[PDB]
């Protein structure tokens, strides 16, 4: 019972971390796309 | 230049799609954690 709890918390936190990481990747790609658009 | 552009757009859409999928994953995992805590 105790074990499964930390596993869930630990894994949910890992998902939140990937969300943040992908959020940051998206911003970087969105910006790269704007710069390309201006180069046209 | 145009070719590089469709690649940026198509990939950004894929990143936004995975964000949605990961968000839902966190929500599902968050709920599974709540039920476990109350199963106590």
């Amino acid at each position, epitope marked *: 019972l105790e074990e499964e709890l930390k596993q869930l918390e630990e894994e949910l936190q890992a998902i939140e971390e990937q969300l943040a990481q992908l*959020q*940051w990747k998206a911003q970087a790609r969105k910006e790269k796309l704007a710069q390309l658009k201006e180069k046209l | 230049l145009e070719e590089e552009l469709k690649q940026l757009e198509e990939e950004l859409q894929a990143i936004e799609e995975q964000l949605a999928q990961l968000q839902w994953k966190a929500q599902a995992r968050k709920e599974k954690l709540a039920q476990l805590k109350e199963k106590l």
Partner: nanobody, 116 residues
Framework: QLQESGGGLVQPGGSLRLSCAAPGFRLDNYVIGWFRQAPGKEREGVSCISSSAGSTYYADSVKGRFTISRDNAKNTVYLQMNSLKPEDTAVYYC???????????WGQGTQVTVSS
């Protein structure tokens, strides 16, 4: 309804500490991201920090000079800006996301001006 503060005028090479807060709304559980928008240009990402503070991200133009951090007890996210350059002049914004497209409300921002 996050409010940015700090910032003002500084000499080129000087420093500022921006803070992000939301009186009565606990930020512990939120990604926090800093964006900035310079005159006539598009808004861009600067840095952001994950809820647990286990991860920080920094725009390349700013790596090595800026440091983002947070304190749950004080319920504030801070951005320390060292070695400021004229190119860092902009309105700086706070939000519960690292991805600008996720943001639904932009503050007033706080103005950062780097000049002699």
């Amino acid at each position: 309804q996050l409010q940015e503060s700090g910032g003002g005028l500084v000499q080129p090479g000087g420093s500022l500490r921006l803070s992000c807060a939301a009186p009565g709304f606990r930020l512990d559980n939120y990604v926090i991201g800093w964006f900035r928008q310079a005159p006539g240009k598009e808004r861009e990402g600067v840095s952001c920090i994950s809820s647990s503070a286990g991860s920080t991200y920094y725009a390349d133009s700013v790596k090595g000079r800026f440091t983002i951090s947070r304190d749950n007890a004080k319920n504030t996210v801070y951005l320390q800006m060292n070695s400021l350059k004229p190119e860092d002049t902009a309105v700086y914004y706070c939000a519960t996301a690292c991805y600008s497209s996720y943001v639904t409300y932009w503050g007033q921002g706080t103005q950062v001006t780097v000049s002699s």
